[PDB]
Design a protein around this ligand. Structure first.
Ligand SMILES: [Zn+2]
Ligand SMILES: [Zn+2]
Lengths: 364, 364
């Protein structure tokens, strides 16, 4: 019988690590990329299709799910695994980021907001967020925090980091209050502090004192640019407990991922562009109209086995759902192949060379 | 090696027949229902999915294909079978019906029209329609005719029937002029004549004198209502050659199909509604919101194995493409199961009883 949660590091190179997270619903190979299963084109894909790319775990957006069709409904009707037809681990976010980006009255208690769909009124808080994630039945639950915009003044960055740490303790206690959740799921805390080294340190200290199963670096991929993001990761990741997973939320492009692994990150997610080893292409571009090759000539995915650039170009320009599904399937597969190459190269002690080789070709 | 075209009747009951059409690309069991493969939700389905429902042949709409991405492009790039990923027979229509319904200047030579997509100018004629269908590479080619609206005066019905027969001879000669098409594909002629028995007779006589591989009953499912349609089929079908397939274009609902088979028809096509043995339901209706049963409790399809009415209700109301795909897959599967029950009951000499039993439950 598998444990509730066990993270084992099998190999290291510099700050990079490769390993496994064992959970009751399955094993997650790290570094891991989590497709966002609650995307329309993603759910249009068979769960089997998503699994066949190599995904070990997918993400669900709590904000979208609570709004449509609702958490209590998902629960009464079987839970999110049944809803997604996905029997392996699922990570849910707290819902708070989409409140800020898509929907508000904020207070120390939580946030109230109006649905972007029907103007109905809704509430999130550390306690309600954890409750909804319990109702969904997810395996990895994110603490509910308060986002900091970029740029942010030091005073604001500090206030939102401090509130986030208070809310991290509330999230921990809410999670621990439900037997079924505490015994079967895992809880991740989120470090805040914007670009400020001392705030990041205070945040890491607070989260480690509370204790979580894994630690996300929050507050990045919000406008800062890759150099700044990498600079913040350089000092922030080593502040987190070494023996637990490190999750960079909302990152990102292939080169972001590679640089973030070089800095100690273990888990990633993000939502006409197709990825190739020679860089992204926009398939709508007229230069692909007579291009008979697949999206990427080394890609092993089912799309690249069967369909040309020329055909996918036509579908996407015509706005056909087949086009969007084919692009999404290939892109998910490309990301899983990237993660596999990363894991192999770290295990084999040649990840530095891999990162160099990857960049040379991807930016050529 | 399979013949270009062979229709064999294995069993009869009254005017109903069951049998097979053998073509180079495969066997078609009759009575047959042809899904329209050029539909967005239909093409979003795997070809394997469509095949797994039992479909032996699919239809392509020449009007849509010539407009986007174009016949010459489909040809240069591999042909419609490659384009659809479907290696079994494909029937294409002539394109003329959608010109009348979607796009005009008509003459004895053919029609010119403006694309409903970009205002570009296009032309169809018996010769150009046959040429485009050759470029697509379809297995069953429809003669290009002139549609008669409903209702139509006798004079108009006669003029359009007579023009259609002239155009049937032109279609025959164009088809016969291309070796690759004549040796490998089949050509169907279309009977016209509206609701008038004498015009239908003249039309059947003209088409039989020219000679085709199969004969469609045209000009129905255009507003007349089922009783009138059935009345026209009662006298029209027996006018056609008995030893060749009879195709009712654009029909239709399950009960239309059953009554049309009782009158001698062998082939059908048509484009929130789900079909069940207990009649159609609209899954969006609030009464299905807590309904945990599948769309139909006897249906063998992959959708009904896995998904509830309650869930599909949510998807369709939210406008999710997964919803439309699940509904389409189940509906295609339902139609193939209907056709299978029809074929079995005719072979077994109990089709009359089947039709009675079907109607009793479907309209209960
Ligand atoms: Zn691919
Ligand atoms: Zn079904």
């Amino acid at each position: 019988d598998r444990p509730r949660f066990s993270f084992s590091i099998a190999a290291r190179e510099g700050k990079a690590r490769t390993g496994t997270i064992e959970m009751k619903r399955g094993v997650i190979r790290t570094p891991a990329f989590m497709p966002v299963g609650t995307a329309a084109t993603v759910k249009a894909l068979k769960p089997e299709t998503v699994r066949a790319t190599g995904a070990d775990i997918i993400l669900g957006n709590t904000y979208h799910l609570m709004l449509r069709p609702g958490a209590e409904r998902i629960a009464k009707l079987g839970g999110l695994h049944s809803f997604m037809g996905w029997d392996r681990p699922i990570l849910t976010d707290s819902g708070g980021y989409q409140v800020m980006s898509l929907s508000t009255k904020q207070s120390e208690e939580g946030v109230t907001f109006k649905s972007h769909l029907d103007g109905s009124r809704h509430m999130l808080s550390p306690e309600r967020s954890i409750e909804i994630q319990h109702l969904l039945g997810s395996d990895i639950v994110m603490a509910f925090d308060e986002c900091t915009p970029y740029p942010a003044t030091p005073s604001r960055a500090a206030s939102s980091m401090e509130r986030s740490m208070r809310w991290a303790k509330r999230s921990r206690d809410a999670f621990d209050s439900r037997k079924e959740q505490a015994e079967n799921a895992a809880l991740f805390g989120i470090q805040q502090g914007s670009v400020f080294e001392n705030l990041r340190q205070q945040s890491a200290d607070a989260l480690a004192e509370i204790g979580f199963d894994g630690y996300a670096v929050g507050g990045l991929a919000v406008g800062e640019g890759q150099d700044e993001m990498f600079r913040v990761l350089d000092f922030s990741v080593p502040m987190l407990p070494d023996d637990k997973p490190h999750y960079l939320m909302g990152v990102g492009k292939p080169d972001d991922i590679v640089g973030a692994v070089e800095r100690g990150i273990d888990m990633f997610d993000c939502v006409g562009q197709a990825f190739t080893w020679d860089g992204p292409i926009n398939i709508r571009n007229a230069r692909f109209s007579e291009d008979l090759k697949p999206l990427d000539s080394e890609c092993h995915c089912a799309v690249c086995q069967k369909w040309s650039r020329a055909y996918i170009h036509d579908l996407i320009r015509a706005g056909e759902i087949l086009g969007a599904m084919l692009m999404t399937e290939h892109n998910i597969a490309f990301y899983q192949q990237l993660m596999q190459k990363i894991r192999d190269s770290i295990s084999e002690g040649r990840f530095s060379q891999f990162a160099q080789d990857f960049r040379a070709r991807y930016f050529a």
